[PDB]
């Protein structure tokens, strides 16, 4: 059998409440619902009792009640609410049934009470399934819990004016919450129904509008088992980065989801829609799985008057509620057949009020006010049931009085001024509160306000345990962790949500948002000033970490050469010294000082505007030996000393003039070689000119040596002549030997200074030996 809640009244008001929750495949609905079914039913009863006793609202007509059960199902709700349309269809079809009794008031002994107005449809699917049947018979509907997005349009569900905001504002609040915690990688869970699908689609829209993506979207059916929920949690666990889980499920739906998550030891930061709410039966048995869960609820306040009325309730006195007895049995785990729980009272047990309670209460008042508008529209003179109230049309009432409600909310707190009104589309005001499941007490759990959304989200992390800095970093769900932007650049695939980052080329730093910046040419990639650093230490190439030895030995040899040359020229009083001219000593001293200056200049001189001077210096250093060879071949060829010195000076001048003419002091240098770890600050202007001048000087030296080698025997001079001839010959041989290695090693610049120092040191040692041979002979 079925139970019908009937309360006599002048104008009966329809009602559809899910007193019974979802049942198994055996029956349509099994266990009774405590928070959703009983509390809202008693709230509607209290609202009707208070309105019937209110002299300022419907003083003459009495508001009856015809309340039915939905069993949290669509087909059951439809077959139950079929009586709502039967009551009108009987009168509609009895128009021609006028023979015996009368013309227009034909009665058959059983006339169902006409349902002028009906409120119900707490579930969105039940709401849309019943709204069509209600509008088919011109019956207005006012909801209190269904927030489906497909009920906003008036083309299909024209006779539907809910007192709650739609899913648009809820999705906005969810998106703002997920953006506040920097949650990017998101997983969603839905249910088989309009509510779940529309909520999920709106959530994906607002997430794509907030640079948030969702990998997989899961859905559940109506008839479900623990195994399917465990499989859903396992599929959610397939991606470890999915720390957050969006839920658009029901109350018992979320309860079984939490049970399955706890059975699988799965940890998630659950974020859900208004289906979760502040219910304790949903989190019952799954306290650990619900730890740190964010829940959004519709904005409302508890009612003190309804709480006192609800607590003072007993099955004996409350005989008007057919389900109250079985609710008492299910709540106190007793049976009235044994007559054992008669002494139990609801006052001792703590009572938790459903958040949406006042909602339906307001709805009732709204409907009542609509009725009051009728009393001010057709029969304003009389107070009792007038003849104009017999035909009730839903179109006029809905389009002129239901949608034009604006009144102070009943049982509202004195601190705030809440006003119930209907918007342009017959929805409610968009405002939500946020709860977080935390262990506020020692062992108990409760819900605490941690923020609210009303045309803008406001949250505080002080009341959120996991978001507080004391607990550490908050649990974040991202597909890819933020890598080091200093040397790792992220690629931009065909997405906007996820990305992968790899280290770019070492010689380029990451400045742009797409590709590592090139840092120009000749600049080292770093982060020193703005984007990278510059190392101008290439020109300053002093160094000599391991080359200090050879250069120090060269300077020591040059100093010893200066010393012995000074000692020799100071010994000019010797008869052997008087046999030679004074010009040879002067030019040899000049050459030794020159090579000493070249040794001292190869390390300390820079490379900015010194390369041309260095080329001229090498030219003069080679011209020293050139003049030596010229005077050697001129003395053996035959006032005379003056002519020889003039010829040597002219040759040196021609050599340096040619060396200066062949080189072109222009502009332009190499930017950087293939390798980019070090920059090059070099005189990359003209080296072909340098090597050509060296080759020409070597050729003239070879010609002079070939001319001089003919007169190997010099009878004018003593055994020093053959000695200096052999010295010139071996210097020419060592020069032609060092020429190819000098031409080949030009690739490496660091070796250039070393080989130049080695060459000048060898030349200096050769000249030192040549000059010390007469000194050793006269020693």
């Amino acid at each position, epitope marked *: 059998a079925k139970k019908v809640l009937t309360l006599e009244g002048d104008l009966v008001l329809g009602g559809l409440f899910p007193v019974h929750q979802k049942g*198994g*495949p*055996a*029956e349509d609905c*099994g*266990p009774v619902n405590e928070h959703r079914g009983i509390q809202r039913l008693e709230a509607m009863l209290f609202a009707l009792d208070r309105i019937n006793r209110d002299p300022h609202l419907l003083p003459g007509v009495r508001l009856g009640a015809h309340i039915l059960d939905s069993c949290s199902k669509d087909t059951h709700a439809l077959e139950q609410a079929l009586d709502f349309v039967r009551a009108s269809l009987s009168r509609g079809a009895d128009g021609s049934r006028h023979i015996c009794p009368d013309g227009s008031y034909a009665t058959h002994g059983d006339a169902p009470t006409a349902i002028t107005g009906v409120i119900g449809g707490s579930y969105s699917d039940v709401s849309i399934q019943v709204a069509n049947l209600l509008r088919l018979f011109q019956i207005p509907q006012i909801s209190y819990a269904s927030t489906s997005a497909k009920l906003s349009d008036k083309s299909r569900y024209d006779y539907f004016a809910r007192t709650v905001p739609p899913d648009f504002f809820q999705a906005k609040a969810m998106a703002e919450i997920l953006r506040f915690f920097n949650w990017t990688y998101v997983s969603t869970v839905a249910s*088989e129904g309009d509510y779940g699908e529309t909520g999920i689609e709106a959530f994906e829209l607002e997430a794509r509008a907030r640079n948030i993506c969702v990998a997989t979207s*899961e*859905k*559940v*059916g*109506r*008839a*479900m*088992s*623990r*195994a*399917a929920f*465990e*499989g*859903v949690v396992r599929a959610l666990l397939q991606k470890p980065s999915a720390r957050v889980a969006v839920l658009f499920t029901r109350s018992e739906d979320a309860r079984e989801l939490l049970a399955a998550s706890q059975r699988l030891n799965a940890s998630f930061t659950w974020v859900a829609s208004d289906g979760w709410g502040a219910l304790e039966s949903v989190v019952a048995g799954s306290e650990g799985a619900a730890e740190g869960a964010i829940t959004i609820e519709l904005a409302s306040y508890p009612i003190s008057d309804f709480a006192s009325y609800f607590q003072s309730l007993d099955p004996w006195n409350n005989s008007r509620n057919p389900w109250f007895r*079985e609710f008492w049995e299910q709540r106190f785990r007793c049976s009235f057949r044994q007559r054992d729980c008669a002494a139990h009272s609801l006052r001792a047990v703590p009572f938790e009020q459903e958040s949406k309670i006042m909602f339906v209460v307001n709805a009732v008042y709204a409907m009542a006010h609509a009725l009051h508008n009728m009393h001010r529209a057709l029969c304003p003179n009389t107070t009792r049931l007038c003849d104009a109230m017999r035909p009730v049309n839903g179109r006029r009432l809905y389009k002129d009085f239901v949608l034009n409600v604006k009144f102070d909310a009943p049982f509202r707190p004195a601190d705030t001024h809440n006003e119930v009104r209907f918007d342009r589309f017959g929805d409610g005001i968009g405002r939500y509160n946020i709860f977080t499941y935390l262990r506020a007490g020692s062992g108990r759990y409760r819900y605490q306000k941690v923020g609210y959304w009303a045309e803008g989200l406001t949250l505080d992390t002080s009341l959120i345990p996991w978001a507080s800095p004391s607990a550490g970093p908050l649990p974040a769900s991202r597909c890819s962790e933020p890598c080091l932007q200093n040397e790792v650049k992220s690629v931009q695939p065909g997405e906007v949500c996820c990305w992968l980052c790899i280290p770019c080329q070492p010689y380029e730093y990451r400045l742009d948002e797409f590709t590592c910046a090139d840092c120009g040419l000749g600049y080292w990639p770093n982060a020193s000033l703005t984007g990278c650093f510059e190392l101008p230490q290439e020109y300053i190439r002093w160094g000599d970490a391991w080359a200090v030895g050879p250069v120090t030995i060269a300077c020591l040899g040059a100093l010893a050469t200066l010393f012995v040359l000074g000692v020799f020229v100071r010994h000019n009083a010797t008869p052997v010294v008087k046999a030679a001219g004074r010009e040879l000593c002067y030019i040899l001293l000049g050459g030794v000082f020159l090579c000493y200056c070249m040794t001292f200049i190869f390390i300390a001189k820079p490379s900015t505007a010194v390369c041309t001077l260095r080329r001229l210096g090498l030219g003069t250093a080679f011209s020293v030996c050139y003049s030596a060879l010229l005077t050697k071949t001129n003395r053996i060829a035959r006032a005379s000393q003056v002519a020889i010195c003039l010829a040597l000076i002219s040759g040196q001048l021609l050599i340096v003039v040619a060396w200066l003419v062949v080189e072109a002091p222009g502009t332009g240098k190499e930017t950087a070689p293939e390798r980019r770890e070090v920059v090059t600050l070099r005189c990359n202007h003209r080296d072909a000119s340098m090597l050509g001048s060296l080759a020409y000087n070597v050729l003239l030296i070879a010609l002079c040596t070939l001319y001089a080698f003919k007169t190997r025997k010099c009878p004018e001079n003593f055994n020093e002549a053959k000695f200096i001839g052999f010295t010139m010959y071996t210097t020419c041989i060592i020069w032609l030997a060092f020429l190819p290695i000098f031409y080949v090693t030009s690739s490496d610049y660091r070796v250039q200074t070393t080989t130049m120092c080695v060459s000048v040191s060898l030349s200096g040692s050769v000249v030192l030996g040549c000059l010390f041979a007469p000194k050793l002979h006269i020693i």
Partner: nanobody
Amino acid sequence: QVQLVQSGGGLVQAGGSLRLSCAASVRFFSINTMGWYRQAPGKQRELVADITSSGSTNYADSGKGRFTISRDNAKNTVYLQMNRLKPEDTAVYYCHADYKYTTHNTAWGQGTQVTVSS
């Protein structure tokens, strides 16, 4: 969607051998999980046996060792054997099948009453 068909009920003596068979049509549906539930009119449902379809199975609180169940995928059928039954097994047993086609829906079956005497 699909539905489940059961057979093998009736009245048996307490402590006797009872076997229940539950089958269905696959219809290209990837069946991931199948199990058995027990409930009473107006009450809640409780799982008594379930197979993960990967060699792993789970049972109820009073069925740790007994109440063995086996599934064959050639016909997609589940068979559970009953050996020790108390008079508290009057509640009807139901079998469920889990399929994943964008819904993760669970298909149920009819009800076969099982009765036990003294």
